A paper describes a structure:
A cryo-EM volume of NDST1 alone was calculated to a nominal resolution of 2.70 Å (Relion Au-FSC = 0.143), with the resulting map of sufficient quality to model nearly all residues along the protein chain, using the AlphaFold2 model as a starting point for refinement. Disulfide bonds between C586–C601 and C818–C828 were clearly visible in the cryo-EM density, with the former at lower occupancy, possibly due to its surface location being susceptible to reduction by 1 mM DTT, present in the sample buffer. The C828–D841 loop at the mouth of the PAP site partially occludes the ligand from solvent, suggesting a role as a stabilizing lid that encloses PAP(S) after its engagement with the sulfotransferase domain. Clear density, distinct from surrounding protein sidechains, was visible at the center of this triad, consistent with Ca2+ coordinated to H389, H393, D320, although a full coordination sphere could not be resolved, possibly due to local disorder within the open catalytic cleft.
Bifunctional N-deacetylase-N-sulfotransferase (NDST) enzymes are the first to act on nascent heparosan after its polymerization, converting GlcNAc sugars to GlcNS, via deacetylated glucosamine (GlcN) intermediates. We have carried out a detailed structural and functional characterization of NDST1, the dominant human NDST isoform, revealing a 3-domain architecture consisting of a non-catalytic NTD, in addition to catalytic deacetylase and sulfotransferase domains. A distinctive feature of the NDST1 protein architecture is the opposing orientation of its catalytic deacetylase and sulfotransferase domains, which effectively precludes a simple substrate transfer mechanism for bifunctionality.
Author numbering: 81 to 170, 180 to 190, 198 to 214, 226 to 241, 263 to 882
Amino acid sequence: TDPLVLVFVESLYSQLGQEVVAILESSRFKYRTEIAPGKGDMPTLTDKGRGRFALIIYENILKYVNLDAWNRELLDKYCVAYGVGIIGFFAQLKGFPLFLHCSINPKSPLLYVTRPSETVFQSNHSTYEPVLLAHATVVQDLGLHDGIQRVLFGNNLNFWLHKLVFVDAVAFLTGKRLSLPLDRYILVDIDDIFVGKEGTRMKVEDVKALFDTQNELRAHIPNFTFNLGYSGKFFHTGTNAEDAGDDLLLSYVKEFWWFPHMWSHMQPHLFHNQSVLAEQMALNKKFAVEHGIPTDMGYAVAPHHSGVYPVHVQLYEAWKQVWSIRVTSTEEYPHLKPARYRRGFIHNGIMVLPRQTCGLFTHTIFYNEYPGGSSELDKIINGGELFLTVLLNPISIFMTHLSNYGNDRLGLYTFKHLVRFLHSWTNLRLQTLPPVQLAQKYFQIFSEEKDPLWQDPCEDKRHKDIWSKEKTCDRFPKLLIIGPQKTGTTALYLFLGMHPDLSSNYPSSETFEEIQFFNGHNYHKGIDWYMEFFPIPSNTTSDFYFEKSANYFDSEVAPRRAAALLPKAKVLTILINPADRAYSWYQHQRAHDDPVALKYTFHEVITAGSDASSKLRALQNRCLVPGWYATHIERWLSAYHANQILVLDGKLLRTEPAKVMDMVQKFLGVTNTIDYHKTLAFDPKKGFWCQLLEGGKTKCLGKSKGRKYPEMDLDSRAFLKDYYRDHNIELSKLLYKMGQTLPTWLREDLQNTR
Ligand SMILES: Nc1ncnc2c1ncn2[C@@H]1O[C@H](COP(=O)(O)O)[C@@H](OP(=O)(O)O)[C@H]1O
Ligand SMILES: [Ca+2]
Ligand SMILES: [Ca+2]
């Protein structure tokens, strides 16, 4: 079955359902949230002979017990025939020999992570085995009465142990398909070393406590080493007891790990010149080399995470120039909140990891100086945010600062009690790796996060504050012409730039008006490369910008990338008859001296068998798969709303573009509506519509657009009639669902089918 988790929750805002979804999202468990049927409608469970869900979860198990008989029998038949368990949440239960009304069963088969060292369901039957005892709050049914095992919880996922039991139940009922290895990796980053004016710095007792705590935690976690964020300027600037305490930290230079972390603790996004930023880091490197600090760890952290997300190219280049940084970390990708959504990415040769916080901040000096009270730190340690981060994430980077190792040394005490809690309650093997080894482990576990998902910095206040002030905000287009190719996109592009309120981007060096940002390696070039094609918004200028790229239509990664950077953009896809589109795109390749289009006739290209060249298969894929209009539009329907997408008839644009452009302007909502009837004039020599300049002169497209070639033969037309027949029927249903008018060729093709 598919690894999707079928989630039934009473409403879209219930606390128990959101807690389950939060656990599944933290564990990268794919889920499909649905409204629980109160004798209503059961969604489809099997597709193409195989089930679509490996595990179902029920936040109100009474909606399964009191389920309608036809749906209940369908669900029970599905779960028996595919081995899918039921996680429930909550007199005798109806349909089961179980009555309804904290220790741990040590021999329970649920236990994969939970260590048994430290409403109830009770009756007399052997079809269930209890997991948590009170009689039995959490019971694991053995499937000896119904047929398939189910785990029923007597309470919510509020307690930390119940979350630990829940992820064990997810692992067991799936068959250890939706689970993680017991190996856990932790790296603690101590920030702002040698930062401060008076007080809260290293004394001799603070360094000795830091060294001793690292030694004793090395017995718990093998090779556990602290990472120190030094800062060379605020050296020997504290009290007399703190001048020696800073000097005592250089005696233990071979006992810790160090990362550069700025010369004078200034945000790198304030550095609009790279060379002065590199000279700052060279001063910090000179300090580290002189004091014996190692300069080969390959890891660094910006003082406010300024310039890692959004990308300040000067920070990335200076890190690789002065330090050869390979790993950094941030808490800004994709957003600061919630922390469970934080991912990593690899950009510009630097692997970025999601940095987390242990709850200890810069202002946290004393135990009672911690905000919320000293019990809030103990709550976070003993089954709070600390424990849940280690449990649900394989790799964690925890943030701590200079003040967390001061008078009370809360950084020591917090990680002391956390590791004791982890090894007394879990079977997890805690490890500590160097940040290079830690990052490689992260992108081997999560290989889908190796590509970044760019966003607009000015849509988030936190991202705007750590963005360079020399970069303007709305330098992004509002209209995307996605294609497909050879449908008339250049004529639509050339007639849109004539509008005074609308501005087109600068042409590229090779791809000209096409940027091809969202569908290839140009996405990895960054958003600052993308902003160079669109002029500075200024004030007294046309603030509406558009760009065309015909390869965005059929691309799979382009819609989600375009929706991430430009969620408010308008999508313009134009369609002609796909038999004609395939033929024109075939003849266009012949006109560009493509050697496999010139070697094979159009009938041979479309009748290409599997036992042929890969060049022919690439051309056949290029001719036919973009003609699957229903497939590619549905990809863009997953990313953009229906009202942000307009589907034009390219044959209508071929004949009457003036009414087409009126539909475009009412789609784009312009103010200076151009009368294109007097502005566009049909050119008999060209065969298409062109400009009507002053004096009767006409400005047409080049020879590449609107070519002339012999007509398609009847055999190839007959093949493209039956090939696209189910595609056009799906396209007709799709365009009817969107509320957009069917094209003239589409309605004609349905009439020929009838
Ligand atoms: N005013 C116009 N000028 C040029 N081509 C136009 C046009 N209106 C529609 N077209 C069509 O645009 C197609 C090319 O689409 P694109 O500009 O995206 O490459 C041409 O197919 P052909 O060039 O095979 O005759 C032509 O039929
Ligand atoms: Ca800092
Ligand atoms: Ca800080």
